[PDB]
Each structure stands twice: as structure tokens, then as C-alpha cells.
């Protein structure tokens, strides 16, 4: 079986099986899944790896069609904590892809420019997982001509160990940088988060950073997102910076989301193929623990259980602008610095496109993520 004939046949199987899933024919879906199992492979080429995670996702969805069987398969629920591995895979994403470095650079510039002249700055991090985002902003605040303001950072995360490492690293750097700095952790999932927990004081300039968190609220195009954006609006932030996936993965039907997500993750899996060896354990961890989980959630989950409801930038702009925010175009030279970052080792093939004052991070011609800055209107 030719490798190129193997790849295209895998695509047909995915669409065919998905139709059998929608039709509900378990016999016809099982036969399609049997074929996928022998051809797909997490160690194979790009299409074999892509097929492996979409195949597992599709099989998980039809497993949910029998709730008794699905639950019984987890009756001995393996309640567990895998924090160290999850920190490790996030570090790999930060280092093997330029997405977060570009996002951090652009959002830190937008915050610094919003905090010109402010002596009291409070930054709210809705996903405080990587301390590299604020370590750079600490040095930049210290280097700014007017000297550093009093900096306060509120970190929100659902795991204490993640907040302990960030707090330790940020206090250690701020103590070296001689910056008056305060970090208060907030242990909470984002849905149960209340404004009162953020403990914002009066008279301090505020900035909100939402890295890949806004689409979470679209789960059961949403009313939960409106309430959260309005809650953020009431806090009167001087700037809100939003980093989101730039793909329509929130389509109504299974076939809709399968078609688009196949194109998006084919691009993401393509970067690793052109850069990292097939035998790399780092590559497999990222492909499984990150993209595989997102693919599985997009394909096999519904209702509130489907949190990876990615939408394009144009939808987010309307949604955020209707919530009372005005767009703050990213700095031309911040965009130039982000492009120079892409000239780094192993970042060729990426491109940054400007779209209505916002940045779109692309692989080849395929959009992947967007970065946008917003201020309160009225």
C-alpha cells in the first residue's frame, strides 16, 4: 500500500465513518474503525498520526451513544493528578511552537503602552500557567524611562502547584529587579470564578490577559460569554488582551467540525513533521496530550462538555465589541518585533498577518491563532 494512497484513504475513512456515526449504524461504523486502526498510527507519518487521534475521537463519540456501556467502562474511576506531566507538555508547546512567545510579546507591549505614566498597575492572568509571560514584563517595567510602578499580578489557575511555581519565580525575579511587586494566587476553575475573588482595588490601573480561555464560555452563540465579558467590562480594565484559536471548530453538525478541524490540525501536525523527528517523545506528548485532547473534545463531546469551541477572529470581534469594548490596534513595531521573532531557529514557515488592528499567526497559509487588544467604551 503506497504511503500517499494510504493517506488519502485515511481521509475517506474518517468522513465515511463519521457519516455512519451520524446514521447511527454501529456495524457500519465498526467496520470503518477496523480499517482505520491498521492504517493509522501515532508513530507513522503526518496523516497516520492525524487519523489516529480522529479515529479515537470518533470511537469515543459512538461509545457515548450507549451511556450504560460508557459509564461502566469507567466505573472504577481513576481519579488522578498528573500535574508534573501537564506542566511539562505546556513547556514543550511554549518551546516547540512560537505561538505563545508572539502572544506574550504582543500583549506585553499593549499592556506597557496602556500603562504609560501609571504608578499602580494590576494585571489579571486568567490562565497563570507559564511565568515567562510576566518575567519579561517585569524587566520591561523596570527599564521604562519613568521607572517601574507598583506591580500587582493576580494569577488564576485550577492547580496549586502551577501557582506555587509561578509565584516563586515571579517574586524571585522581582526581588532581583528591585520592583515593588505582589502576587496573589486564585485557585479556581474559570467558570466558578467570581469578580470578588480578583480583589481589585480602587485607583489602580488594570489589565486583563485571556490566553485561550474565552472560547471556554461558549459551552452549554452563547450567553455565558456575554456575562463574563460584561463582568470584565465592569472592572474597567485599561486594556484587555485576547489570544484565541482562529478556526471555526464550533459548527453545528459533526461533519462541519470534522471538516474544518481536519484542515487546522493537519497544519499543526505539519509543523512538527517538518521540524522534529518522528521518534521524538516531545512531539508525541504535544500531539497526544494537547492536540489529541482538543480533537477528542471537538469531535466526541457535546453541550457543556465541549469546551474547545474555537471560533474565528471576526466572530470574537463582534462578540467583544458588543460587550462594550473598543479595539486597540496592535503597535506596528510590536508587530515588527513579532515577525523578527519568527525569523528564529525553527520558526520558518510561520507568518503574521494584520487584520483590523489584530494579529493572526499562520502556518503557511493556514490561520492558527489571533491576538487582539481591547479597551472599555463609554
Amino acid at each position: 500500500l503506497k504511503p500517499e494512497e494510504r493517506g488519502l484513504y485515511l481521509i475517506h475513512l474518517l468522513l465515511t465513518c463519521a457519516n455512519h456515526v451520524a446514521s447511527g449504524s454501529l456495524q457500519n461504523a465498526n467496520a470503518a474503525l477496523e480499517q482505520l486502526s491498521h492504517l493509522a498510527s501515532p508513530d507513522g507519518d503526518t496523516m497516520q498520526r492525524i487519523a489516529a487521534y480522529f479515529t479515537e475521537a470518533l470511537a469515543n463519540r459512538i461509545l457515548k451513544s450507549w451511556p450504560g456501556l460508557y459509564k461502566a467502562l469507567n466505573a472504577t474511576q481513576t481519579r488522578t493528578n498528573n500535574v508534573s506531566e501537564e506542566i511539562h507538555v505546556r513547556r514543550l508547546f511554549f518551546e516547540m511552537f512560537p505561538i505563545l512567545k508572539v502572544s506574550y510579546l504582543l500583549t506585553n507591549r499593549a499592556i506597557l503602552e496602556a500603562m504609560e505614566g501609571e504608578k499602580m498597575v494590576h494585571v489579571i492572568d486568567l490562565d497563570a500557567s507559564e511565568p515567562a509571560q510576566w518575567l519579561a514584563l517585569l524587566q520591561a517595567f523596570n527599564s521604562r524611562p519613568e521607572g517601574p510602578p507598583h506591580l500587582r499580578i493576580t494569577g488564576v489557575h485550577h492547580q496549586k502547584e502551577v501557582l506555587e511555581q509561578m509565584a516563586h519565580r515571579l517574586i524571585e525575579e522581582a526581588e532581583k529587579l528591585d520592583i515593588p511587586f505582589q502576587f496573589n494566587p486564585v485557585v479556581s476553575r474559570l467558570d466558578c470564578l467570581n469578580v470578588e475573588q480578583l480583589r481589585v482595588k480602587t485607583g489602580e490601573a488594570l489589565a486583563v490577559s485571556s490566553v485561550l480561555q474565552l472560547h471556554t464560555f461558549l459551552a452549554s452563540s452563547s450567553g455565558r460569554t456575554d456575562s463574563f465579558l460584561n463582568a470584565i467590562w465592569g472592572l474597567s480594565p485599561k486594556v484587555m488582551v485576547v489570544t484565541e484559536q482562529d478556526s471555526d471548530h464550533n459548527g453545528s453538525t459533526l461533519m462541519e467540525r470534522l471538516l474544518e478541524s481536519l484542515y487546522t490540525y493537519a497544519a499543526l501536525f505539519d509543523c512538527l513533521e517538518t521540524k522534529v523527528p518522528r521518534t521524538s517523545q516531545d512531539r508525541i506528548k504535544v500531539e497526544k496530550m494537547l492536540f489529541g485532547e482538543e480533537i477528542k473534545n471537538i469531535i466526541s463531546c457535546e453541550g457543556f462538555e465541549r469546551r474547545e469551541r474555537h471560533e474565528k477572529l471576526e466572530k470574537w470581534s463582534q462578540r467583544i465589541d458588543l460587550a462594550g469594548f473598543g479595539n486597540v490596534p496592535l503597535s506596528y513595531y510590536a508587530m515588527l518585533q513579532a515577525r523578527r521573532l519568527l525569523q528564529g531557529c525553527g520558526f520558518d514557515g510561520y507568518r503574521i498577518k494584520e487584520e483590523s488592528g489584530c494579529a493572526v499567526i499562520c502556518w503557511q497559509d493556514r490561520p492558527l491563532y489571533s491576538v487582539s487588544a481591547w479597551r472599555c467604551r463609554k
Partner: peptide, 14 residues
Amino acid sequence: MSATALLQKAAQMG
């Protein structure tokens, strides 16, 4: 034989 091009080749004939 990129995967992003395989999807393009299959979608045309399908």
C-alpha cells in the same frame, strides 16, 4: 506529500 495538501487533493475529487 504534505497532509495539508492531501486534504486538498481528496476534497477536489470527492
